[PDB]
Design a protein around this ligand. Structure first.
Ligand SMILES: O=S([O-])[O-]
Ligand SMILES: O=S([O-])[O-]
Ligand code: FES
Ligand code: FES
Ligand code: FES
Ligand code: FES
Ligand SMILES: [Cl-]
Ligand SMILES: [Cl-]
Ligand SMILES: [Mg+2]
Ligand SMILES: [Mg+2]
Ligand SMILES: [Mg+2]
Ligand SMILES: [Mg+2]
Ligand code: NA
Ligand code: NA
Ligand code: NA
Ligand code: NA
Ligand code: NA
Ligand code: NA
Ligand code: NA
Ligand code: NA
Lengths: 267, 267, 267, 267
């Protein structure tokens, strides 16, 4: 019947019955896959065939060997659920053996895992491992799982209003920097400084009593610390590793909203 | 509510309700976990809280930020599935920060991965990565998913019978070695030589016509290749990785039965 | 060893070592369970043994069959963690079988569940089901989750001051009625009219500019509507239900504080 | 991280990630839901937000007031586990009050309880209440918590071998029926007859001494007794409750393995 296709390029999954070409099913789901011709006679749509059976008798550009490892998405019907990696044109031309592509494949594992970072004590070293071997695919951790303890008095753009003596009702919509050292050793060992945004209402009475009610969201944070920072957060064993292995920066998505409330009395 | 508790100390999983102290449940399952005071007031039962949430109000002494990274198995109620590492009294007694334990945690990162190996082009590199990060924990792959293509003619303890000229009905129960180079590049790139066992009935008629009906099962395969073998299977990149990061041997369980039938004519 | 005892009367928990009678351990932690003889010689201290194991060889009043379901707290040592329901002296005095205490035990389930009301569109019917089967135990919902949208113009004790032409600074501390129809159909469908309290400061300048800044808390609300009101709120089916099944009133606790502020100009 | 979305239209329950729209996550699960646009524009996606919180900022159609009760599922992220009902669109007319849905929602209130049955004296009445309000969702209790006391003499497929006079070593793999009246009043009051399976080795020496070693597992049990059985197990009160509120059969999962040993002498 219908089989699921996972494209490791961007970690997207789309349905495809056994009478639809893989490329058309992808476009049907709004996906912009590569193609030049559309008749099984070039390599513009070539994808790695990581796992699954495909019927590509319509394919003519790949021979018998390449068909064991690659698939023309415009000319192939699925026979099972499939994993593919689109956009690997340079690979097909230079392909020699499994051996010669195994390092590239080992590098795809990080992106094929769940994007969600491991929790607890694993989160910072999971982040560092993905830096070493993940080749830039995004990871994620909900803002509610990061372990932040944000007090209103730690939010400069709100305290900026309070401390200038203003009185009244203020619609807050501000970015601010959060040094997660204030929050705990776990977030401080892979996130460091992060950019947050708060939206809400600050009320300040004639006599300086204030309240704030709103939410906090987080921008994606770029994991690209230098070795000196890795040494501060993880220790000099990280420096010995980075002396031999280069990291690849990637984004940590931090979805969700953190509710925030606070009250105080000025001066 | 019961939850899953893995102790990467010996990689054992046991059941524990939200009313059971983790030390008691593990003692139920006959496990030998460290303890001394059994009263929430010493460092002998302390495990790392690598993942999960717990109820440690009877713990008392932790109290500090310590409670987010340590758990007292004699006085803790599981509020979730938990990865824990017993035997860390030394880290509790003298950790300054995450810096001191990050390298230990890093090497343990695959210790709670699912056992099933990835399929297809991923299987050999998945097996290699688990060698580096798996903490010696089991992987598995069904014998029907390995990609084995065995003819009876490649089974010596059966062919040894046919070629001696015997005539009759043989109950076969024989181990034999299988070099999966014969089966394909994928199994050859992480299994190499495996030991199989076949059980069945071999019939040889007076005129030399023969047939065999049976099954094939596989013993657990130790993944422990030396650097030369990895260099052959994967290439020279594997050597730099293995030098810096250490491999821990683990077993690949190959459950299931593979059916086999064959027939021929001796002369 | 030392164990935990949970008395379903109030859902109170306390410790009890294996060499302390349940009753004594309860008093040593501030509780006040019934007793008279304190010598295993009546039913003043009897409790249902929901679960757990006790040594009550000192318990004369209970025969072996009764000791499967009941425990004399002055005569029993905990062998394990225990859930009990004290004060059930009559239950025993009429006991004959599990069958004959099952309706009573069913009526304890509502009190045993979490006291927080379900959310959203389940809140009004969760409240009605607890009315039917909860036998009077408290429920709760945080004032912030009720769905109140209160404007100072809806608070008569504040508006009465402004509307009389007064000028100055008023310390406010007043109860007032909140018809939660003003707030939304969910609160209107189980809370109806509730009593709130506000404390804060009303300042009215000579030119009639005014502002109010304070907080709002909620008294416990007694859920005790008559069938006419249930029919208004839930529909005719509730009258069919109430024609065969009686409710028991219970209090809904509404903890927390809401921030309130308002501004206006009298002319 | 990832939340359970439960849709009342099919009693279906499917995961949805914090960064994924509810409709997309439903499409990936195997579900078919209504969709006309996908920019928050129409109402074909609209669902009733029964329980939980969503982020609907991308959505444009619904007013701030309708967002309290309605969710555009192609444009909404879950903030929490959610209960919705898809296949709604007419209700936006404003011709359905809370009164019109209240009886429906009341009847499935137990449908999101955790699956583990309560222990001890509560188990039978917990099972009965789930029959009334659980909407057919599963419950569970570990076989080791049920209170079974099975002796090998009560296992007919083992005694059958012993009693025919056989001598040797036998692999046992046999279903058999257990009337839990044999085990205790609690299991007899909600499980009744259950089907179990035992796997193990029975050895019988020439002199008729026998030993059995193995384990026992339980099949899922359907809770669907008729009003007569409920009266016998709980009493007359259960019939009036059952008449008014009605039962929905559901399965009780009984996981785990119960170890069993027997020793005897055939003589
Ligand atoms: O600005 S927020 O959506 O990250
Ligand atoms: O843990 S690393 O330094 O091999
Ligand atoms: S686009 Fe040319 S082969 Fe598919
Ligand atoms: S054994 Fe001492 S704290 Fe647990
Ligand atoms: S007080 Fe009399 S039996 Fe306990
Ligand atoms: S399909 Fe139109 S808003 Fe969802
Ligand atoms: Cl995969
Ligand atoms: Cl309060
Ligand atoms: Mg950062
Ligand atoms: Mg091998
Ligand atoms: Mg009221
Ligand atoms: Mg049954
Ligand atoms: Na959000
Ligand atoms: Na929050
Ligand atoms: Na439990
Ligand atoms: Na080396
Ligand atoms: Na106002
Ligand atoms: Na329950
Ligand atoms: Na058998
Ligand atoms: Na009903």
């Amino acid at each position: 019947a219908t089989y699921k296709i996972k494209d490791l390029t961007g970690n997207v999954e789309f349905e495809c019955s056994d009478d639809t070409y893989i490329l058309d099913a992808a476009e049907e789901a709004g996906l912009d896959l590569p193609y030049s011709c559309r008749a099984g006679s070039c390599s513009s749509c070539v994808a790695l065939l990581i796992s699954g059976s495909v019927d590509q008798r319509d394919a003519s550009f790949l021979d018998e060997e390449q068909q064991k490892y690659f698939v023309l998405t415009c000319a192939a019907y699925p026979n099972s659920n499939c994993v593919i990696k689109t956009g690997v044109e340079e690979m097909l031309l230079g392909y020699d053996s499994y051996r010669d592509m195994s390092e590239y494949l080992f590098g795809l594992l990080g992106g094929n895992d769940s994007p969600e970072l491991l929790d607890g004590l694993f989160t910072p070293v999971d982040a560092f491992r993905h830096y070493l071997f993940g080749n830039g695919t995004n990871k994620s951790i909900n803002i509610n799982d990061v372990g932040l303890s944000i007090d209103v008095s730690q939010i400069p753009p709100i305290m900026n209003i309070i401390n200038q003596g203003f009185i009244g009702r203020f619609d807050i919509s501000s970015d601010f920097n959060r040094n997660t050292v204030l929050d705990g050793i776990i977030p401080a060992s892979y996130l460091g400084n992060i950019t947050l945004k708060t939206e809400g209402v600050l009320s300040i009475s004639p006599d300086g009593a204030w309240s704030y009610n709103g939410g906090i969201r987080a921008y994606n944070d770029l994991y690209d610390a230098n070795p000196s920072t890795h040494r501060d957060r993880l220790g000099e064993w990280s420096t010995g590793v980075l002396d031999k292995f280069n990291g690849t920066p990637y984004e940590i998505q931090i979805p969700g909203t953190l509710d925030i409330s606070g009250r105080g009395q000025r001066l």
